[PDB]
């Protein structure tokens, strides 16, 4: 007797799917929507290399920390990678004013160029090579931050300094300088003859007056003194005016800056792996069409939505009771 029957596909597949009303429903074909894989590499972000400071902090790199690698011109970056605890930060101990906002500003830069702004050879009535410490060694020799100059009295005097720089460049330029807070009046007198001292810094926007703070402090890297750093963005064709009586850590080098966008500072122990992505993670980059992932929350770029799950499996086939 002749027959026709209507039926559906089956296979030996073992993929399981969950349902609002059922769990572990074995099925013909399934597709995971959740991304779990990364490349283990730090990569370019949209074809733009990140700035990787290996054992240096942003501060140690901006200032010329001798223990930080020699300065290499990276004219452009998309994000910054620091390690959890860079060993090389401030060789001479102290502080950096509005440091976090500066790091955020530098997180993504379209053009960056170190530029000599006030030559060390132009300080004529002050000693510019005695401002040196064993805590900041350069080549066996005791030294100091390299883009910045620690001025010490000459002969037995410290003439009042008046110096100004006009930004004749076509870009904003980041200017950095500092104060020395010594441990006692005798160190004051010894380094800069004048006992009561100031540093005034002026711009079309800035109106600052810093006074050293003598205080007995615990030793850090063997030092009880402190270096406190400050910065501004000198607009093109504006000028910056420094005046000081002592305790002045003057600029020598500064930075041309062009900023078009923002990112952040990524903490990772990984390193560059000649690579490009649209999504970078401290554990590695992601090539992602999937709408969700579970790698790591601290991401940068057009990444899928971070989620706490091990599986988002979509049924595409049909019920398969083998």
């Amino acid at each position: 007797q002749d027959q026709i029957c209507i039926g559906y596909h089956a296979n030996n597949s073992t993929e399981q799917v969950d349902t609002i009303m059922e769990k572990n429903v074995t099925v013909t074909h399934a597709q995971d929507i959740l991304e779990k894989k990364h490349n283990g590499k730090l990569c370019d972000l949209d074809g733009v290399k990140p700035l990787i400071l290996r054992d240096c902090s942003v501060a140690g790199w901006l200032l010329g920390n001798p223990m930080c690698d020699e300065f290499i011109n990276v004219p452009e970056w998309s994000y910054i990678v620091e390690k959890a605890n860079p060993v090389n930060d401030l060789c001479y101990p102290g502080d950096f004013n509005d440091y976090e906002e500066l790091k955020h500003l530098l997180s993504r830069i379209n053009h960056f160029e170190k530029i000599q702004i006030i030559p060390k050879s132009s300080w004529s009535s002050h000693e510019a090579s005695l401002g040196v410490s064993s805590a900041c060694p350069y080549q066996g020799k005791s030294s100091f931050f390299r883009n910045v100059v620690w001025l010490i009295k000459k002969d037995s005097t410290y003439p009042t300094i008046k110096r100004s720089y006009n930004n004749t460049n076509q870009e904003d330029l980041l200017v950095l300088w500092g104060i020395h807070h010594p441990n006692d009046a005798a160190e004051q007198t010894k380094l800069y003859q004048n006992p009561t001292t100031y540093i005034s810094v002026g711009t079309s926007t800035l109106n600052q007056r810093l006074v050293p703070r003598i205080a007995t402090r615990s030793k850090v890297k063997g030092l009880s003194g402190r270096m406190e750093f400050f910065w501004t963005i000198l607009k093109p064709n504006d000028a910056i005016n420094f005046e000081s009586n002592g305790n002045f850590i003057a600029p020598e080098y500064a930075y041309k800056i062009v900023k078009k966008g923002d990112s952040t500072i990524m903490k990772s122990e990984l390193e560059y792996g000649n690579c490009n992505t649209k999504c970078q993670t401290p554990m590695g980059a992601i090539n992602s069409s999937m709408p969700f992932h579970n790698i790591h929350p601290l991401t940068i770029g057009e990444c899928p939505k971070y989620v706490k799950s091990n599986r988002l499996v979509l049924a595409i086939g049909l019920r398969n009771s083998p």
């Binding site: 002749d2 596909h9 994000y79 903490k267 991401t299 989620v307 799950s309």
Partner: protein, 175 residues
């Protein structure tokens, strides 16, 4: 299922059918065999693929950078950022999981409906020219060669071509 077909009156899938998702099986004098219903299979595949692609593509993804930039005298703001991240993670996790469950159920029920509709189309095609076995199998009241089954899958089964032989065999069977 919702339409009583797939794990209802048809009790089992066909390992033998590989060409498609839904189809037909015949056993006549020329032998037996499976053959897939191309069209309905294409509709189902295109539909489900459309569903996955809509779950994926409807996602809006902009550039964001995160992000731990507050110091230890800015921990209240830090906590605000944590409540934000944790809130978004909770929202996305809940919504993703439930989306997956809901749309999976609908997918299975969709297959169910497709099989059922196939059965109904054939059923109405042969009418009183065959017996419904309940399996999803139809027993012919006449001789349906390969071109005839061809006509059923085509949807061109010529009912009046066989109606009479069928009435005859039927009343032959009648008592």
């Amino acid at each position: 299922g919702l339409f009583g077909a797939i794990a209802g009156f048809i009790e089992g899938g066909w390992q033998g059918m590989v060409d498609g998702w839904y189809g037909y099986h015949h056993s006549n004098e020329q032998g037996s065999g499976y053959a897939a219903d191309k069209e309905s299979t294409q509709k189902a595949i295109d539909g489900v693929t459309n569903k996955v692609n809509s779950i994926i593509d409807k996602m809006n993804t902009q550039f964001e950078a995160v992000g731990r930039e507050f110091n230890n005298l800015e921990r209240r703001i830090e906590n605000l950022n944590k409540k934000m991240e944790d809130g978004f993670l909770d929202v996305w996790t809940y919504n993703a999981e439930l989306l997956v469950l809901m749309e999976n159920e609908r997918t299975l029920d969709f297959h169910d409906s497709n099989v059922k509709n196939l059965y109904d189309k054939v059923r109405l095609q042969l009418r009183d020219n065959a017996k419904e076995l309940g399996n999803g199998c139809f027993e012919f009241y006449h001789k349906c060669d390969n071109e005839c089954m061809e006509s059923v899958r085509n949807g061109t089964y010529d009912y009046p071509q066989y109606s009479e032989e069928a009435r005859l065999k039927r009343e032959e069977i009648s008592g």
